[PDB]
């Protein structure tokens, strides 16, 4: 009997008189709580279609909310979602997002959210209907719960779809999402808002836009928050944005928090914390100072020890040290701290196996920076940091005469470059020259690369200040190539190469 009224009500919804259409909409609205009448409207394509057309057309808000609410109730069942879907439900609902009447707006956004969640093919529908831009524009509202629903939709849509990301990007999404993170305290909201940003951060072109809005800073306010899922999202997001944001201001609090995050028991948080700092201290002196000033050096040291064999933690940690140990005020203070905190012995052990190139690559560079400090010369030597360092240079030079993501050329460079600084100490020169390094120190001058030549002359510059060393060089035949590098257009290569021959001139 109930199935006989439906084909009648349909007729009524289509009626012209907006006095009875309201009535029809009201009765239909009431026939949404009954498991029978619902499954009767639901299973009637002409009925559901009639409702959708009415909703978006009947400008009488009292009717628009009855119809919208009706569809809202159909979005709890698979057959309901399907009816809504195949009846052009999405495009209409998307259009209803422009309704100035909150009751209507809430029905739409909510139902849409259900559709996206459980109805397959709903994502394209919202995308095609200009839903992305309309949602991003709705990030102006101050309703924490409404924002939570809207931000989750965007995430669902943006996940796996590059175009959606580019769209959100162009819609000013980054600026809006950032404001939520730095305005609202509602966890659910903040959490789902981060998930959105996480999805956006993987996109190269989306990355900068986020950093400009002040994403780095905003994400750092919640690294302390109780919510595990919230923190674990800001870490993954920052580890993505990090490499880019080497120009930002007011990063202290963040840098500081990242430092003490290196202490968390959760090894996974320590991993991100280090990976992030490694990128923020890269060619950024202000970030290097800030880190050292909050005891960053000491922390990273502990991190390395606490890591151990696992190169997943040591790699980012070492790079961060490699950074903090040069080109700023507390550069010296940093080189001392690494020694003072008993980090020298362990670092050398990192050159030796079973370590890999990506690790060895960073370790050598750090040793170079640690050699700058005079009070590190002796300690480093004692740890056999010379025999093993050159040992790796020999194995690195053979592989270029005849990997793991690292080219052997720059490995050959890092070795010699470190030995340069690590030759200011007299005792060091003795060991260096006592391991027959001169013969191959000359072949480095025949290197096509300007970098290899630049350090190949600097090391011999330190060795040349001796007598028993200046002769072994000329006896090998290095007196000729040195004369050639005098003209090298490279500003650096032409500086040491000149001082080398000179040292052999005034004995």
């Amino acid at each position: 009997l109930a199935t006989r009224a439906i084909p009648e009500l349909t007729k009524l919804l289509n009626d012209e008189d907006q006095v009875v259409v309201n009535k029809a909409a009201v009765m239909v609205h009431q026939l949404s709580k009954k498991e029978a009448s619902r499954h009767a409207i639901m299973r009637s394509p002409q009925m559901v279609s009639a409702i959708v057309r009415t909703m978006q057309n009947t400008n009488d808000v009292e009717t628009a909310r009855c119809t919208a609410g009706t569809l809202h109730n159909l979005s709890h069942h698979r057959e309901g979602l399907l009816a809504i879907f195949k009846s052009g439900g999405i495009p209409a609902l998307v259009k209803m997002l422009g309704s100035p009447v909150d009751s209507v707006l809430f029905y739409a956004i909510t139902t849409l959210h259900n559709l996206l969640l459980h109805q397959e093919g709903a994502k394209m529908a919202v995308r095609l209907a200009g839903g992305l831009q309309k949602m991003v524009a709705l990030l102006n509202k101050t309703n924490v719960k409404f924002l939570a629903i809207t931000t989750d939709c965007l995430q669902i849509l943006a996940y796996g779809n590059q175009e959606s990301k580019l769209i959100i990007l162009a819609s000013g999404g980054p600026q809006a999402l950032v404001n939520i993170m730095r305005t609202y305290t509602y966890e659910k909201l903040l959490w789902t808002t981060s998930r959105v940003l996480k999805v956006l951060s993987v996109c190269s072109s989306n990355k900068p836009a986020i950093v400009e809005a002040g994403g780095m800073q905003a994400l750092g306010l919640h690294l302390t928050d109780p919510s595990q899922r919230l923190v674990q999202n800001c870490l993954w997001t920052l580890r993505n944005l990090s490499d880019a944001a080497t120009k930002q201001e007011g990063m202290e609090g963040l840098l500081g928090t990242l430092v003490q995050l290196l202490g968390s028991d959760d090894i996974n948080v320590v991993t991100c914390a280090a990976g992030i700092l490694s990128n923020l201290t890269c060619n950024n002196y202000k970030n290097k100072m800030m880190v050292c000033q909050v005891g960053g050096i000491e922390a990273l040291v502990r991190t390395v020890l606490r890591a151990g064999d696992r190169e997943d933690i040591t790699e980012p940690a070492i790079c961060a040290l490699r950074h903090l140990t040069s080109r700023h005020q507390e550069a010296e203070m940093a080189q001392n701290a690494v020694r003072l905190h008993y980090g020298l012995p362990v670092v050398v052990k990192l050159l030796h196996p079973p370590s890999h190139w990506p690790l060895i690559k960073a370790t050598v560079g750090l040793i170079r920076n640690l050699a700058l400090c005079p009070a590190n010369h002796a300690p480093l030597r004692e740890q056999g940091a010379i025999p093993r360092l050159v040992q790796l240079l020999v194995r690195a030079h053979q592989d270029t005469q005849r990997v793991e993501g690292v080219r052997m050329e720059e490995i050959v460079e890092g070795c010699t470059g470190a030995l340069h600084i690590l030759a200011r100490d007299v005792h060091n020169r003795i060991v260096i020259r006592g391991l027959n390094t001169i013969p191959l120190f000359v072949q480095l001058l025949y290197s096509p690369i300007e970098n290899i030549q630049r350090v190949a002359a600097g090391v011999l510059c330190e060795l040349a200040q001796d007598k028993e060393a200046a002769e072994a060089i000329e006896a090998e035949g290095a007196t000729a190539p040195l004369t050639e590098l005098l003209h090298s257009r490279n500003e650096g290569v032409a500086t040491y190469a000149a001082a080398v021959l000179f040292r052999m001139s005034e004995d």
Binding site: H72, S103, F106, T110, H113, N143, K145, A148, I149, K188
Partner: peptide, 15 residues
């Protein structure tokens, strides 16, 4: 609690 209602019963349904 209107029309806030609408969002609150929905949140419960999902989150």
């Amino acid at each position: 609690r209107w029309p806030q209602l609408i969002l609150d019963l929905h949140v419960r349904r999902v989150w």
